Write a protein that binds this ligand. Structure first.
Ligand SMILES: Nc1ncnc2c1ncn2[C@@H]1O[C@H](COP(=O)(O)OC(=O)[C@@H](N)Cc2ccc(O)cc2)[C@@H](O)[C@H]1O
Ligand SMILES: Nc1ncnc2c1ncn2[C@@H]1O[C@H](COP(=O)(O)OC(=O)[C@@H](N)Cc2ccc(O)cc2)[C@@H](O)[C@H]1O
Ligand SMILES: [Cl-]
Ligand SMILES: [Mg+2]
Ligand SMILES: [Mg+2]
Ligand SMILES: [Mg+2]
Lengths: 362, 356
């Protein structure tokens, strides 16, 4: 009974190390893998979350890239919260600060995520407005206590989380908003903040708040990297950077048109967004990269690892046009279930029609 | 023609109010208000951050009773969450609430036990309508930049000099929201609060709200010692407290600043002018014959002439101001000496360390 106990304990540590190692694989940065390892030792599921301003069409980093990450976590003992940050978009002047339009876009985001090929068993969609107003004393008390703990300058270091900067006129809303986002982490009892690296400053503020308050339960920051825009030098795909985005409602022709003229330098993967889509979206989705091409250009070839793919790209074995053509085809295939849903479901088709009539305000 | 009477009345009302007030942001709006066949809503707000000083009881009572007697409601906003946000009473909301309770006991025994006065708790009222309240706070924050809002630091007793926490941006957004949340017609606070009252009127113009609050600011009662332009818990030994005993009052007044011939920033004279003379409609100065003998003052003009000309020595003014303050505090003393439950409450809050 000492050797089966030993074999019971060994098998558990190997499981955790493998669970940790590929939870880390979706990530650009983890603020303490050792703390993540610790948290995966709990019997319970770990609460993870990301949050979204409903501010316009959804681009493929928020749908396609997101679902890969969420699927990895929910198949590894996590629960995942999508926080529909409607009050936040309103505070940040989005959708002309019209909350009815914001909530329409939020419903649209949920329709997208539900047809994204995410396993939904351990996924929840929570609306900021609804949840804050279920427990408004607890929530605003937290907001106020966070505001007392940090000075203004420190909080202005979080402007990037709302797409703002010191350069513009800074409204007091830009102090309230990061206090609220920080409060959300505690309000939602999050174990893992799982947002893009542009949100990291307010996730670090939350850890700092823990030290200030002598809270030992600190959230782990599991940041994912920025999916780049189509054009050279666009580090971040977004509605804000013109011509940078493929959207979740783009048609098969739109995707083909956008990929064709995207930046894809020969022999180079640094700052190459076509390669980035291959590496961050297609390869995790398919677990191989199957490069299809004409016999004239070398026929088809399957890449079973990312190193294989990189090697053949930098040495000119893969021409840019072959890389672009396959990336377009795989993005189109990954968007097929979303397209089907908005063609076959007339309520959802309606809703997409309504939200596309809106004006994208900043 | 009976609106003739209506207009004569209101004009008299307005003249009295402006005299006691230090500044009124638009008499003409206040006149329009006073000519609404409804009850106007007035308010003042207090952080429960320590013992109450005489500006907040004895002086407060004079303007409150003038407004309520004309049909107004006067809300005393017990700003418990604001005190916690402003780091008072060690941020112990339980102590803040006990202080708030003791405030109500003081106010009820110094002239505010009345139908037209409401004692409302900030925490309680915000949590009845939290979506409405916080939506306002957020929309106010969107409307003003950080520099504009830091111009309100004085309303919390803070300055640009010290470390400015984000709580000092949130607090004025919340105090501004209160004005609309409480449907206030007249903000009747000290002049140290005027920056955020002006922000509320600016918010109305930004939002095209035509119902704008009148700001009716009262002047600051000076502290006991030289150059303390404002009595406060903040300056130690600046304050006479509503719970001070007769020996405490006598001790503090004897020690106080009272420059001969000088009325400017002379706190002893300020207490005579702003509290005693309005409360009694006269000032009876008791003195020995060799020092000028007893004299009854029926106007502030004569009191000022006699003081500036050296007819009233500072010791005589002090002895009489102390007598009168003790007289005015007698109903408070009797309440806390007899109402054993108020007695126990005073004994507890006296034991609280005042924090900033
Ligand atoms: N190009 C890209 N590549 C990869 N990830 C991306 C890219 N663009 C955006 N994201 C990620 O999408 C999510 C939404 O983005 P956004 O709506 O801007 O978030 C905000 O405003 C946040 N303050 C919203 C918010 C509010 C409260 C709260 O408690 C949590 C969050 C974030 O995780 C972004 O990092
Ligand atoms: N020496 C003095 N002479 C004459 N009046 C004085 C003197 N000292 C203080 N007051 C006056 O007493 C009252 C309380 O004072 P405080 O508790 O400091 O107020 C604050 O902090 C206010 N932000 C509290 C507040 C919060 C929310 C809101 O919706 C309204 C108000 C104010 O009206 C002061 O002007
Ligand atoms: Cl409400
Ligand atoms: Mg082929
Ligand atoms: Mg009453
Ligand atoms: Mg005599």
């Amino acid at each position: 009974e000492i050797e089966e106990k030993k074999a019971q304990e060994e098998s558990k540590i190997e499981d955790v190390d493998k669970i940790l190692n590929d939870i880390l694989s979706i990530s650009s940065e983890c603020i303490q893998p050792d703390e993540l390892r610790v948290k995966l030792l709990l019997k319970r599921k770990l609460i993870c979350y990301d949050g979204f301003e409903p501010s316009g069409r959804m681009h493929i980093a928020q749908g396609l890239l997101k679902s890969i990450i969420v699927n990895k976590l929910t198949s590894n003992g996590c629960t995942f919260i999508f926080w529909i940050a409607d009050w936040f978009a309103h505070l940040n002047n989005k959708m002309s600060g019209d909350l009815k339009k914001i909530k329409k876009v939020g419903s649209y985001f949920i329709e997208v995520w539900k047809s994204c090929g995410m396993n939904m068993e351990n996924v929840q969609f929570l609306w900021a407005s609804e949840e804050i107003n279920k427990k408004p004393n607890e929530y605003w008390s937290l907001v106020l206590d966070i505001s007392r703990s940090f000075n203004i300058n420190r909080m202005k270091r979080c402007l990037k989380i709302m797409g703002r900067s010191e350069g513009e006129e800074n409204y007091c809303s830009q102090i309230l908003y990061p206090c609220m986002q920080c409060a959300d982490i505690f309000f939602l009892n999050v174990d893992i903040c799982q947002l893009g690296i542009d949100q990291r400053k307010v996730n670090m503020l939350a850890r700092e708040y823990c030290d200030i308050k002598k809270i030992k339960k600190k959230p782990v920051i599991l940041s994912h990297g920025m999916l780049p825009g189509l054009l050279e030098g666009q580090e971040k795909m977004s509605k804000s950077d013109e011509n940078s985005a493929i959207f979740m409602d783009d048609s098969e022709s739109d995707v083909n048109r956008k990929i064709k003229k995207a930046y894809c330098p020969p022999n180079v993967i640094e700052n190459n967004p076509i390669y980035a889509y291959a590496k961050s979206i297609i390869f995790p989705s398919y677990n191989e990269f199957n490069l299809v091409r004409k016999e004239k250009n070398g026929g088809d070839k399957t890449y079973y690892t990312l190193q294989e793919l990189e090697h053949d790209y930098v040495n000119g074995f893969i021409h840019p046009l072959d890389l672009k053509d396959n990336v377009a085809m795989y993005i189109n295939k990954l968007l097929q279930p979303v397209r089907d849903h908005f063609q076959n479901n007339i309520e959802a088709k309606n809703l997409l029609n309504e939200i596309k009539k809106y004006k994208v305000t900043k």
